[PDB]
Amino acid sequence: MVVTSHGVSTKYLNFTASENTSRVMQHQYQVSNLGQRSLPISLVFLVPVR
Amino acid sequence: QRIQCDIPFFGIQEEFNATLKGNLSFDWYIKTSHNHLLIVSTAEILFNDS
Amino acid sequence: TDLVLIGAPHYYEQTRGGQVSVCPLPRGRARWQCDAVLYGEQGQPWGRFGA
Amino acid sequence: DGLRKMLADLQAGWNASSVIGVQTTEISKSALELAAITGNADNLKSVDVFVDRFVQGERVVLDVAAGGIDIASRKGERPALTFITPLAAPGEEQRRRTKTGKSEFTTFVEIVGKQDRWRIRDGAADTTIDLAKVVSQLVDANGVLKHSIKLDVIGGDGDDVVLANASRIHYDGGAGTNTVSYAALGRQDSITVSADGERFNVRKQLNNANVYREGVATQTTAYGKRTENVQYRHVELARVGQLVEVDTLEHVQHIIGGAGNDSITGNAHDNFLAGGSGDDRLDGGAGNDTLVGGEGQNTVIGGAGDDVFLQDLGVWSNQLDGGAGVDTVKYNVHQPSEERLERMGDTGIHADLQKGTVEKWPALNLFSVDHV
Numbered sequence: 001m002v003v004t005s006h007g008v009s010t011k012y013l014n015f016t017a018s019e020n021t022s023r024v025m026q027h028q029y030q031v032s033n034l035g036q037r038s039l040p041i042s043l044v045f046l047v048p049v050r
Numbered sequence: 051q052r053i054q055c056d057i058p059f060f061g062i063q064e065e066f067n068a069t070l071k072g073n074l075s076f077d078w079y080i081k082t083s084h085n086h087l088l089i090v091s092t093a094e095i096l097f098n099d100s
Numbered sequence: 101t102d103l104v105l106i107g108a109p110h111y112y113e114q115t116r117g118g119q120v121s122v123c124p125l126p127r128g129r130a131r132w133q134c135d136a137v138l139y140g141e142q143g144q145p146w147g148r149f150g151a
Numbered sequence: 152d153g154l155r156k157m158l159a160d161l162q163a164g165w166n167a168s169s170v171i172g173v174q175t176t177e178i179s180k181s182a183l184e185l186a187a188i189t190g191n192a193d194n195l196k197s198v199d200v201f202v203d204r205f206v207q208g209e210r211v212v213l214d215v216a217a218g219g220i221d222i223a224s225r226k227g228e229r230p231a232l233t234f235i236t237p238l239a240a241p242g243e244e245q246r247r248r249t250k251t252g253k254s255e256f257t258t259f260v261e262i263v264g265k266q267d268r269w270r271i272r273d274g275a276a277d278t279t280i281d282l283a284k285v286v287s288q289l290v291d292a293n294g295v296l297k298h299s300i301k302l303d304v305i306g307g308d309g310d311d312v313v314l315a316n317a318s319r320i321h322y323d324g325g326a327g328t329n330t331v332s333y334a335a336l337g338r339q340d341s342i343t344v345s346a347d348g349e350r351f352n353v354r355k356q357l358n359n360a361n362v363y364r365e366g367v368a369t370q371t372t373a374y375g376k377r378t379e380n381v382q383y384r385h386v387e388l389a390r391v392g393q394l395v396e397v398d399t400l401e402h403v404q405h406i407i408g409g410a411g412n413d414s415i416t417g418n419a420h421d422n423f424l425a426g427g428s429g430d431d432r433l434d435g436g437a438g439n440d441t442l443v444g445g446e447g448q449n450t451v452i453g454g455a456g457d458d459v460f461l462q463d464l465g466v467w468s469n470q471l472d473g474g475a476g477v478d479t480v481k482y483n484v485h486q487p488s489e490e491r492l493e494r495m496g497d498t499g500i501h502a503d504l505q506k507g508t509v510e511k512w513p514a515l516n517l518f519s520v521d522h523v
């Protein structure tokens with residue numbers, strides 16, 4: 001089973017320090033069970049916060 | 051932040067998307083020599099290795 | 101019920117006539133398919149096997 | 152009129168013979184405006200309450216000043232009591248008019264608030280009370296919490312069902328087999344039910360709960376010269392972060408938890424403990440109890456007596472302990488689903504009490520096993 005980033009995930013953002021506008025970011029992953037078996041799995045996302 | 055999501059049944063030859071969405075701000079930016087900083091988020095699949 | 105037998109008495113081959121198809125019943129919403137075909141003896145054209 | 156359809160839907164869903172449906176009507180902005188133009192905004196009242204009977208969308212003694220809903224009912228009747236519009240606070244409203252100097256006669260609203268409770272008496276029938284859409288907090292224009300409006304309900308004779316909410320609930324079931332349902336709680340919420348003999352103490356932990364609260368709005372009018380102002384009550388929605396409340400239950404035999412991870416414990420009588428969705432812990436205690444773990448990874452303790460476990464051929468794994476006495480686990484309650492038939496066919500379960508395992512999806516996943 002494979003996990004891949006997907007194209008619609010945000011690639012670029014830019015900002016001006018003189019302005020305080022926020023922006024939305026999404027990281028989209030695609031998970032597939034290409035094998036011949038079905039199993040319980042766990043997904044872990046590490047997210048930089050501060 | 052380590053977000054861990056548990057799926058009890060991941061079926062055979064089936065797939066799904068897992069988006070990770072939130073809003074941003076740019077008050078953490080460090081004025082380094084390079085004109086850009088990269089924000090990297092990692093998603094990795096675990097299972098019972100035994 | 102497990103299966104349905106369907107007959108084609110006017111199937112044409114150079115040496116056999118007649119044909120019967122075995123069709124197991126579909127499971128849930130799966131498609132209905134044929135799996136096996138039964139035949140009569142050789143050298144009997146227009147024998148109408150499966151009438 | 153679209154409300155007929157939703158009243159009919161509620162009546163059909165609950166298997167209710169009829170629905171009462173208290174409704175609350177805040178004063179129209181036009182009426183308060185006109186009270187401001189005329190100058191006589193003082194004696195007016197801002198919130199009015201009406202109650203009717205509604206069978207399939209067509210057509211009880213209440214005192215707003217004392218917090219008492221008194222409905223009469225007959226045996227065999229199976230009615231429902233709902234709140235179409237948010238129910239206001241108890242007590243009587245009073246208004247005055249103050250000179251306020253250069254500002255011309257502004258400040259108006261106040262509430263006596265001798266009591267901080269709503270009391271509902273249902274009579275003698277199988278009554279359903281829907282305690283949603285009830286105000287649980289009262290505040291002033293400054294935004295400070297004065298009282299926590301609490302709900303007290305009495306059951307009577309028959310089998311009575313109440314659907315709980317964020318308010319502090321003292322539910323007296325009376326006679327008959329009675330039920331409290333916390334199914335409105337979300338996944339982030341939880342309950343912890345503990346037994347003190349015949350009484351139950353319920354601790355509800357609601358994270359980012361959404362609660363109606365009543366404040367004081369302020370509409371103003373200029374009339375060609377120096378302004379005269381008014382005010383009025385205003386129910387509204389808000390999320391108040393973390394809330395902890397301690398409900399109390401008496402003469403209740405059945406409890407249903409929410410969509411979160413609940414911890415529910417019974418007593419020496421016969422209990423119906425349901426957990427719903429989430430990783431719930433159910434303990435029946437003594438007596439012949441029935442235990443429904445629902446979805447999720449549940450741990451279920453039966454205790455002494457002859458207990459019944461109900462299962463649903465799910466994908467999760469469950470932990471089940473029977474305790475003393477002769478116990479039973481049943482898998483035949485639910486009809487198999489379509490995807491179950493597609494993925495598995497006509498195969499059901501492989502159960503072995505020597506191994507202590509029940510495999511609900513044999514040879515397709517090895518972790519959908521109930522341990523008994």
Ligand SMILES: *[C@@H]1O[C@H](CO[C@@H]2O[C@@H](C)[C@@H](O)[C@@H](O)[C@@H]2O)[C@@H](O[C@@H]2O[C@H](CO)[C@@H](O)[C@H](O)[C@H]2NC(C)=O)[C@H](O)[C@H]1NC(C)=O
Pocket residue numbers: 098099100517518520
């Ligand atoms: C990883 O799995 C092992 C084995 O689990 C058993 O075999 C699987 C095929 C499936 O059928 C499971 O339901 C079985 O329980 C776990 O090891 C077992 O752990 C239980 C208690 O959790 C213990 O009673 C057994 O003796 C253990 N057996 C063995 C062979 O180790 C193990 O805990 C799992 N790992 C994690 C992190 O959950």
Ligand SMILES: *[C@@H]1O[C@H](CO)[C@@H](O)[C@H](O)[C@H]1NC(C)=O
Pocket residue numbers: 021022023024073074
């Ligand atoms: C995120 O930012 C965008 C643009 O600044 C805004 O439209 C949106 O409402 C924000 N969402 C949240 C949850 O802050």
Ligand SMILES: *[C@@H]1O[C@H](CO)[C@@H](O)[C@H](O)[C@H]1NC(C)=O
Pocket residue numbers: 008030065066067
């Ligand atoms: C994931 O998103 C993409 C968007 O292009 C979509 O085409 C795809 O079908 C999605 N994955 C699944 C399993 O639906």
Ligand SMILES: [Ca+2]
Pocket residue numbers: 273274275276277278306307308309310311
């Ligand atoms: Ca009653």
Ligand SMILES: [Ca+2]
Pocket residue numbers: 306307308309310311324325326327328329
């Ligand atoms: Ca009762």
Ligand SMILES: [Ca+2]
Pocket residue numbers: 408409410411412413426427428429430431
């Ligand atoms: Ca639950």
Ligand SMILES: [Ca+2]
Pocket residue numbers: 417418419420421422435436437438439440
């Ligand atoms: Ca019990």
Ligand SMILES: [Ca+2]
Pocket residue numbers: 426427428429430431444445446447448449
């Ligand atoms: Ca559950």
Ligand SMILES: [Ca+2]
Pocket residue numbers: 435436437438439440453454455456457458
């Ligand atoms: Ca018991």
Ligand SMILES: [Ca+2]
Pocket residue numbers: 453454455456457458473474475476477478
């Ligand atoms: Ca027992």
